[PDB]
């Protein structure tokens, strides 16, 4: 593969609390256009959660996490982060970071089909 993604962080967190997930990109990183977190909650389809356009830092969220999660990047260190603030039970899921080197319009930024490279999947478990 020409890009590799490795996640770190995750695990247990109390409701209302915060955790930060990280994703380190390696390989052909200058060409990455979006870094985007997906998740797959228990017994659900995978869904796009938070997308970041690398050129500008603009961000796009699924409705259920708006006002709670923040995605950010560190271009120099080829990192993306998901700040899971204000966590809720509905957030328990496998979180997986995706990346693409092919620009797509914003309306496709949360679609699975837009991404070519994937991290390993990281469990986050919220307690009430």
Numbering used by the authors: 0 to 127
Text from the published report:
Among them, miniature single-domain antibodies derived from the variable region of the heavy chain-only antibodies of camelids have gained relevance due to their high therapeutic potential and the robust techniques employed to generate them. The usefulness of VHHs relies on their ability to specifically recognize antigens with high affinity despite their small size. The kinetic parameters of the interaction between the VHH antibody termed D3-L11 and its antigen HEL were determined by surface plasmon resonance (SPR) analysis at 25 °C. The values of the association rate constant (kon = 6.1 ± 1.6 × 106 M−1 s−1) and dissociation rate constant (koff = 7.9 ± 1.7 × 10−4 s−1) were determined as described in the methods section, resulting in a dissociation constant in the sub-nanomolar range (KD = 0.13 ± 0.04 nM).
The X-ray structure of WT D3-L11 in the absence of the antigen was also determined, achieving a resolution of 1.15 Å. The coordinates of unbound D3-L11 were aligned to those of the antibody in complex with HEL using the Cα atoms of the residues of the framework region (FR). The conformation of the residues contributing to the affinity did not change significantly in the unbound form compared to the antibody-antigen complex (RMSD = 0.76 Å among main chain α-carbons). Collectively, the X-ray data suggests that the interface residues of VHH contributing to binding the antigen adopted a rigid conformation. The structural data showed only minor differences in the conformation of the main chain between unbound and bound D3-L11, suggesting that preorganization of the interaction surface is a key aspect of the mechanism of recognition. The rigidity of the residues comprising the interaction surface would ensure a highly cooperative mode of interaction of the three CDR loops, enhancing the affinity for the antigen. To clarify the conformational fluctuation of these residues, the R2 dispersion parameters were determined by NMR. Those residues with significant fluctuations (Rex > 5 s−1) were exclusively located in the FR3 (Lys74, Met78, Tyr80). Except for Val103, residues in the CDRs showed little fluctuation, suggesting that the CDRs were little dynamic in solution, in agreement with the conclusions extracted from the crystallographic data. In conclusion, the paratope of the VHH antibody D3-L11 recognized its epitope by a lock-and-key mechanism, and is organized similarly to that of a conventional antibody (Fvs).
